[PDB]
């Protein structure tokens, strides 16, 4: 079949990856193709289940890399990172921006 892929089909690409690879589903317009990477490309976060390891697009506005849904990890440069989610302001609880923009 393919690379790091234990079950393929030309129509859909790979369907099941190696015991410890992530499946990346690529939306090449009206069609869907799956691949098997060891880390998910920028914009996606790694998701592990017993049955399937999925790369998941990180639906957080103005974010770059992420730990999961609803928790961002390296926010957009130009925006501040306070406890997962990103803000222009940010606490003022015990934080505020200093040298690098990582809302202490």
């Amino acid at each position: 079949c393919a690379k790091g892929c234990e079950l393929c089909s030309e129509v859909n690409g790979c369907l099941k990856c190696s015991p410890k690879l992530f499946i990346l589903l690529e939306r090449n317009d009206i069609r869907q193709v799956g691949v098997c990477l060891p880390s998910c490309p920028p914009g996606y976060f790694d998701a592990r289940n017993p049955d399937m390891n999925k790369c998941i697009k990180c639906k957080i506005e103005h974010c770059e890399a992420c730990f999961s849904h609803n928790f961002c990890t390296k926010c957009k440069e130009g925006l501040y990172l306070h406890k997962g989610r990103c803000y222009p302001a940010c606490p003022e609880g015990s934080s505020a921006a200093n040298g690098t923009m990582e809302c202490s």
């Binding site: 089909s9 129509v11 859909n12 369907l15 869907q32 799956g34 049955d51 399937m52 999925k54």
Partner: protein
């Protein structure tokens, strides 16, 4: 010799058939030629019949008098007509059967008195009607059954007493009517009947007790040994007793829906080799599967809304020829083999408590079309469970806590339903599944695997839903 404004034509040679319907008459004409074997007077606003009527038409085989406003009929109005085979008097305003006018018409076969305002049937006003086999007393104001007037009708074969106000049937009420084949009593108010109220009619084949006010099962049914078709739906019965229909083998159709049934004895439907369909919804008190000894020709069996915990392992020995099985809304956990129940086309075991589907649980069902196991707790399905089902096209496994999925068999169904199975994260390809046109998937990314201001064109191929 045919009246004015009426249309007319010959009979079996010579004799003349007359249609003088809705001309809005006031009275008949005497212009009526003899040789009349057919006289249609209808909707013609006739009051009296009459100061100067016309018997003397010894050839009349059929007279119609519908839609003409009458209240009573002269005792000698029909005297001269000896050849009368059918009389029609429906849709008038008789408040009682003609006290005499109708007795002794030995040729009369069919008599219509429906859609009037009659509330009283004079004792044997039907006397000497030894050829009458069809009586219509529909849409009237009766309050009791004319037992005595009926006693003079051993000729009768078909009778309707529907849409009245009868509320009781006393013993032997239809007692001498032994030639009667069809009795219709629907849309009355019968709340009570005797232990022996249908003891007379030996020949009766169908019995309609629908749309009435019965509180208990009609046990009087037991003597009806040749009954073929029974209805007592839309009543108020609360249960069906053990060995209910023992007295009626060769029964074919039974109808008791819209009835607040709670329990049915498991014996009740024994020994009816002629029954085809059985249906039982909302029977909360039913705890075990009905015994169906001597009734193997069931084509359809539905029993829902009960507490059936388990099926016998040999359930399908009395169910060949079965085509649909519906045991939805029960407490089934463990399932039998169902293989012996061939000719099965639909199976509905939804909203139950099944946890496992083995290899043999549906094997060798070559005619199976639809299988629904939705809203269950099915965790394990043997991978080859569906391997031998050529006819399978619809499958509902929604809400079931599955984690994997069998691709052997079912290699070309058309309806697939898997939503509610959260652990079902596995992916699937379009090949394996031609003929698929409707799908529902636990997760959208799986749906995607199937493709999912001027002109525009729909080009509908296939569906899916997250």
């Amino acid at each position: 010799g045919c009246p004015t404004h009426c249309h007319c034509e010959p009979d079996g040679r010579m004799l003349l058939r007359v249609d003088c319907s809705d001309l809005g008459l006031s009275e008949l004409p005497s212009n009526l030629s003899v040789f009349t074997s057919y006289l249609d007077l209808s909707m013609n606003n006739i009051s009296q019949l009459l100061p100067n009527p016309l018997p003397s038409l010894r050839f009349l085989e059929e007279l119609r008098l519908a839609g003409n406003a009458l209240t009573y009929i002269p005792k000698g109005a029909f005297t001269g007509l000896y050849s009368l085979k059918v009389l029609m008097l429906q849709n008038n305003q008789l408040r009682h059967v003609p006290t005499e006018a109708l007795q002794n018409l030995r040729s009369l076969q069919s008599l219509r008195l429906d859609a009037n305002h009659i509330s009283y049937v004079p004792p044997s006003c039907f006397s000497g009607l030894h050829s009458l086999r069809h009586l219509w007393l529909d849409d009237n104001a009766l309050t009791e059954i004319p037992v005595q007037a009926f006693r003079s009708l051993s000729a009768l074969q078909a009778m309707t007493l529907a849409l009245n106000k009868i509320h009781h049937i006393p013993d032997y009420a239809f007692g001498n009517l032994s030639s009667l084949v069809v009795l219709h009593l629907h849309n009355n108010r019968i709340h009570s009947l005797g232990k022996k109220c249908f003891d007379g009619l030996h020949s009766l084949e169908t019995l309609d007790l629908n749309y009435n006010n019965l509180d208990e099962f009609p046990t009087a049914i037991r003597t009806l040994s040749n009954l073929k078709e029974l209805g007592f739906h839309s009543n108020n019965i609360r249960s069906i007793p053990e060995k209910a229909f023992v007295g009626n083998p060769s029964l074919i159709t039974i109808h008791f829906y819209d009835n607040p049934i709670q329990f049915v004895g498991r014996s009740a439907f024994q020994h009816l080799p002629e029954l085809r369909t059985l249906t039982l919804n909302g029977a909360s008190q039913i705890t075990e599967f009905p015994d169906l000894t001597g009734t193997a020709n069931l084509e359809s069996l539905t029993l829902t809304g009960a507490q059936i915990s388990s099926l016998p392992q040999t359930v399908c020995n009395q169910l060949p020829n079965l085509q649909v099985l519906d045991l939805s809304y029960n407490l089934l956990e463990d399932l039998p083999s169902f293989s012996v129940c061939q000719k099965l086309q639909k199976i509905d075991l939804r909203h139950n408590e099944i946890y496992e589907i083995k290899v043999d649980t549906f094997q060798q069902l070559l005619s199976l079309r639809s299988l629904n196991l939705a809203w269950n707790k099915i965790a394990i399905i043997h991978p080859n469970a569906f391997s031998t089902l050529p006819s399978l096209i619809k499958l509902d496994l929604s809400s079931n806590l599955l984690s994997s999925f069998p691709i052997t068999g079912l290699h070309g169904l058309t309806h697939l339903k898997l939503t509610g199975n959260h652990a079902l994260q596995s992916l699937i390809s379009s090949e394996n599944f031609p003929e698929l046109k409707v799908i529902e998937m636990p997760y959208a990314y799986q749906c995607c695997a199937f493709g999912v201001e001027e002109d525009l064109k729909a080009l509908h191929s296939v569906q899916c839903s997250p």
